């Protein structure tokens, strides 16, 4: 359910490229809420492989794709 | 025709730094006042 | 300055003060949160007052206070008490 | 230092390698000049 | 001996000293010399003598002397007015005579009990109900709520500007919502006939005329009314329709017209802010509210200040008009409400209400009936009811957490509707 | 729905008391759908201050982690309101260990000395996650 | 993606401060705190903190500046066009300059959004700054 | 006095203004008092504030308008002053002050009086 909905998201937002600003004040913090409980789920998956580097490299991003 | 009718109708305070000042540079007077009236 | 007025001895009654605002703060506080309307005395024999309780209409202010002083009276009737308030025209201020 | 917080953190738990560590950097002063120290050991230091 | 008092009088201790014996010991007198010469009358602690060096200090260090030295008009305009003027006598004029002639014919029937029955009916009633629901709105208090004429549905305005309409009867959620280009609204009335029109008076200065759409929330701008400085506290309907009285601050009142969106008349004469703006039923006169606590009656016809009311201490806030046309109510920060029977005019005067505490800010009258029931709601957290003639305060009604800032009634009397502080609409049986 | 007001309730309510041990519980509930995450620390050591603190913010706080992350932080919190005990913290305890394994068994002695199915709720409350 | 579509239209909805910061920054804030308003929430201390990448043992970190919080401010131009000496002041003192700035940009009605604090605001930073690297003059024997 | 700013309400008149800075300072002395626009701001957003003053002759103006906004959400009663160097003074800074925060503390010993102020205070509201 994910992609489907952030393609639709994407998409609108290459359409029409005022009216959305309050939808991106309310969308702000729940993708910043997501991310991180994916990067913590993500943590939870190496605490038996590689445990130190969720100290070693903060970012989600680049943890996700060192992960990779 | 319009009428426009008529109308019908302290303290202050200082700093802690401004106390030590006044504190000082009145009790400054009072005790030379004392010295000089002592020589 | 006000008053204060009830229905013979054992009858209810209205108290009235007026004034500067920090006096009228300390005298609600007097009667209300000190003083116990419920508690029991024994006057001279014993009295029960349980069901006895005081109440706060309004608070507010006034044009003037036709009060010279404070007085305290007793009234057979509900009418010579309005009468008694109608001297300084303040007959509304009993909620019966 | 970079070698060194691991290296230290193999012989000693990483609090007191991290404090070694980043006393190294401080700020270095000799009158009107300064520098922050990076890359040298400062031996002027009781356990260097 | 020259060289003795010399150095003794070059010091500045005794050169103040000498000053001090000098200056005149009162409080009010040294605080007077203090406050012409614009220092500070008083300091944070103090007794008078510290307070009298003080004024040798100051006195010294300036070099100042001793306190010795130390010390109606008719402007003619708008022809096009005087035709509506002409207007509002003849329909005035009409409606007032058919009014009046009524209460003649009320007069005439008596038989004191069925009156006294239905009186004491409806103060049963009333001290009977309790509130069905609540709801929401926004994140802001709730300033205005105001019923169609048909009472089907409600319109609430808050500080943020935005308003919305609801269902009255169920208060589910809405028919739609608006966020108008205003930021603080006032208040708000319905047209007295159509229902398809609104109107809000907000902090702007800018007054809107809303269409409501049917059962649409494509609600509609009809046009925009300006001419006001500060904001606008109050606005209401003509009761004939075609004209708009607006109160706002600048203690200045206007009387609009609905269709051409013109000023016709701006009135003048309040000391401070105009709270509060109120029509006679007949639309004869109209009351005005200030923060000058100074009720000023007005003959919009002729233009002139009929007669002016002070019971207040504090501002007024609601101004209230009796759908009987002789009488009058205003409330105020003071928490009284002044009841004014014009008619009587000599001795009986005022009888005013020991309402609410803790000010007072919705006064009502019942619609339909002529009038009985008061509705008052304050900040007391509690909404009152009074009977027309013994004023006597009969039920109080307690649903509101915070405090209300506003209410209206249903025309028949089976719901109260109130916003506050709370955010919650809250309806009443 | 809309918590937004359930904010504004709280701090009407939490004036008066204003110290109850519950309207921290709420507050502290308050901030993990809530968007901010620039006070949640503050009013953690507020609700601390403020409360005496009490078991129940202290729970409230470890399954505030435990909920989001870091399994091992919420076992000091947890633990740390065990010694002020009165079953509301064992559950979330079992659950934190549930995560990080292999120390259950010797903890059930203490829930015994502690105390019918207590027993067979725990094994109830286990299957929720 | 949302970062990029607000520095495009952001001049309109935040005119003073993508004038005292620029553009590229100020998209990247207001992207942050997800608003105008939600970002003149914020106090005038906490802003310097946004883009400081993560605090960590080993990552050995003492600026001969004196900063502490390297953030997206750090990077822009009225920092960093200054000798080194003066940036521990000059964040302080532009961080505050950033927040009033925005505290007038959720004043400002949409329909008319206006600058003329911030070019005050530019005057007193870049002039005190220039006073900050300006030295003593000398003093006599 | 100047035109009053229209954006400034409520002012609070002197009146209530001397029992306003009066309780500023007897606030500042038992250290219940934050000052500062953005040590108010986290005072709002904490939510330990009792009330939020304000200098109403603030040039500009717009630069303290966002605390009404904030007050409104809070629910926290808000005036303002007619100067900022009295509200500079009461509060024991020598330097102009255009907000200040009364914090709260329900065992404290001028509780009282800050009711009292606020009861006034939520009368200007309307």
């Known amino acids: 359910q994910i992609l489907p909905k952030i393609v639709d998201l994407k998409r609108i937002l290459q359409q029409q490229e005022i009216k959305l600003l309050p939808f991106f004040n309310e969308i702000i913090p729940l993708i910043k809420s997501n991310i991180k409980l994916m990067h913590n789920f993500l943590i939870s998956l190496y605490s038996r492989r590689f445990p130190e580097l969720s100290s070693l490299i903060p970012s989600p991003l680049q943890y996700s794709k060192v992960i990779s | ?39 | 300055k006000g008053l204060c007025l009830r229905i013979r001895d054992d009858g209810p009654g209205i108290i009235i003060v007026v004034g500067n605002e920090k006096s009228c703060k300390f005298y609600e506080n007097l009667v209300m949160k000190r003083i116990k309307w419920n508690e029991d005395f024994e006057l001279h024999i014993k009295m029960d007052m349980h069901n006895n309780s005081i109440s706060k209409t309004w608070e507010g202010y006034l044009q003037d206070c036709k009060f010279k002083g404070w007085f305290m009276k007793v009234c057979n009737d509900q009418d010579s008490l309005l009468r008694t308030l109608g001297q300084f025209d303040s007959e509304h201020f009993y909620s019966p | 230092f970079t070698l060194l917080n691991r290296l230290l953190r193999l012989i000693v738990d990483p609090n007191i390698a991290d404090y070694i560590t980043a006393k190294n950097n401080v700020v270095i002063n000799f009158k009107d000049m300064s520098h922050v120290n990076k890359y040298g050991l400062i031996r002027g230091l009781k356990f260097a | 001996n020259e060289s003795t008092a010399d150095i003794l009088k070059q010091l500045p201790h005794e050169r103040l000293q000498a000053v001090l014996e000098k200056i005149p010991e009162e409080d009010l007198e040294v605080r007077r010399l203090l406050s012409i010469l614009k220092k500070p009358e008083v300091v944070e602690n103090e007794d008078v003598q510290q307070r009298r060096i003080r004024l040798a200090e100051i006195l010294m260090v300036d070099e100042i002397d001793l306190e010795n030295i130390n010390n109606d008009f008719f402007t003619p305009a708008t022809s096009e007015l005087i035709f509506a003027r002409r207007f509002l006598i003849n329909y005035s004029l009409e409606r007032s005579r058919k009014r009046l002639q009524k209460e003649m014919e009320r007069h005439q029937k008596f038989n004191t009990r069925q009156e006294l029955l239905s009186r004491r009916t409806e103060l049963q009633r009333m001290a009977n109900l309790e509130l069905a629901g609540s709801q929401l709105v926004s994140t802001k208090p709730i300033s205005a709520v105001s019923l169609s004429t048909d009472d089907m549905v409600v319109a609430t305005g808050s500080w943020a500007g935005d308003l919305q309409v609801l269902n009255s009867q169920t208060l589910q959620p809405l028919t739609q919502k608006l966020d108008s280009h205003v930021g603080k609204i006032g208040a708000i009335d319905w047209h007295p006939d159509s229902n398809n029109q609104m109107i809000s008076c907000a902090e702007d200065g800018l007054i809107k005329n809303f269409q409501y759409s049917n059962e649409e929330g494509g609600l509609r701008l009809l046009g925009d009314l300006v001419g006001h400085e500060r904001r606008i506290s109050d606005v209401k309907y003509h009761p004939s329709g075609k004209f708009i009285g607006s109160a706002s601050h600048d203690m200045t009142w206007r009387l609009w017209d609905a269709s051409t969106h013109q000023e016709l008349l701006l009135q003048e004469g309040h000391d401070k802010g105009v709270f509060s703006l109120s029509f006679q039923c007949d639309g004869s006169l109209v009351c005005s509210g200030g923060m000058d606590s100074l009720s000023m009656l007005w003959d919009i016809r002729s233009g002139s200040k009929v007669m002016t009311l002070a019971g207040h201490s504090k501002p007024i806030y609601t101004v209230a008009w009796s759908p009987n046309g002789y009488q009058v109510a205003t409330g105020g920060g003071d928490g009284i409400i002044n009841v004014w029977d014009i008619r009587k005019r000599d001795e009986g005067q005022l009888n005013q209400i020991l309402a609410h505490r803790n000010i007072v800010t919705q006064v009502r009258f019942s619609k339909e009936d002529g009038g009985k029931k008061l509705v008052s709601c304050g900040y007391d957290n509690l909404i009152n009811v009074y009977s027309s003639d013994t004023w006597l305060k009969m039920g109080s009604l307690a649903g509101h957490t915070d405090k209300i800032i506003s209410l209206d009634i249903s025309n028949n009397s089976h719901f109260l509707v109130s916003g506050g502080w709370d955010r919650s609409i809250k309806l009443w049986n | 729905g809309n918590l937004d007001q359930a904010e504004l309730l709280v701090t009407q309510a939490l004036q008066k008391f204003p110290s109850n041990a519950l309207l921290w519980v709420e507050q502290i509930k308050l901030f993990k759908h809530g968007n901010k995450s620039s006070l949640k620390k503050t009013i953690f050591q507020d609700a601390l201050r403020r409360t005496q603190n009490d078991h129940r913010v202290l729970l409230e706080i470890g399954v505030s982690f435990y909920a989001e992350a870091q399994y091992e932080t919420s076992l000091k919190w947890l633990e740390r309101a065990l010694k002020k005990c009165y079953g509301d913290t064992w559950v979330w305890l079992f659950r934190t260990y549930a995560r990080l394994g292999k120390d259950t068994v010797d903890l059930y002695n203490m829930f015994d000395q502690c105390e019918c199915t207590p027993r067979e709720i725990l094994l109830r409350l286990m299957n929720d996650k | 993606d949302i970062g990029q579509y607000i520095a495009s239209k952001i001049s309109i909805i935040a005119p003073n401060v993508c004038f005292l910061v620029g553009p590229e920054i100020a998209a990247q804030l207001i992207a942050h705190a997800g608003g105008v308003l939600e970002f003149s929430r914020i106090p005038s201390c906490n802003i310097a903190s946004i883009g400081k990448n993560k605090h960590l043992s080993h990552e050995l970190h003492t600026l001969e500046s004196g900063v502490r919080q390297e953030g997206y401010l750090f990077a822009s131009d009225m920092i960093q066009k200054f000798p080194v000496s003066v940036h521990k002041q000059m964040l302080r003192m532009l961080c505050a300059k950033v927040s009033l700035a925005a505290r007038v940009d959720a004043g400002q009605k949409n329909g008319d959004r206006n600058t003329v604090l911030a070019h005050k605001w530019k005057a007193e930073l870049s002039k005190k700054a220039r006073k900050l690297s300006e030295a003593p003059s000398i003093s006599e024997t | 006095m100047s035109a009053p700013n229209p954006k400034a309400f409520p002012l609070a008149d002197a009146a209530l203004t001397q029992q306003i800075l009066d309780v500023v300072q007897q606030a500042a002395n038992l250290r219940q008092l934050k000052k500062g626009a953005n040590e108010a701001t986290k005072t709002l957003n904490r939510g330990i504030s009792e009330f939020i003053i304000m200098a109403a002759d603030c040039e500009p103006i717009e630069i303290l308008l966002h605390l009404p906004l904030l007050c409104e959400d809070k629910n926290v009663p808000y005036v303002f002053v007619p100067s900022r160097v009295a509200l500079g003074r009461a509060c024991g800074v020598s330097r102009p002050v255009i907000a200040a925060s009364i914090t709260t503390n329900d065992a404290s010993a001028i509780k009282t009086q800050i009711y009292a102020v606020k009861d006034k205070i939520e009368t200007l509201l309307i």
């Open chain 2, 1 to 39: 025709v319009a009428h426009p009718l008529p109308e019908k109708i302290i303290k202050a305070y200082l700093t802690q730094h401004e106390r030590k000042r006044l504190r000082r540079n009145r009790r400054k007077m009072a005790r030379e006042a004392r010295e000089i009236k002592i020589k």
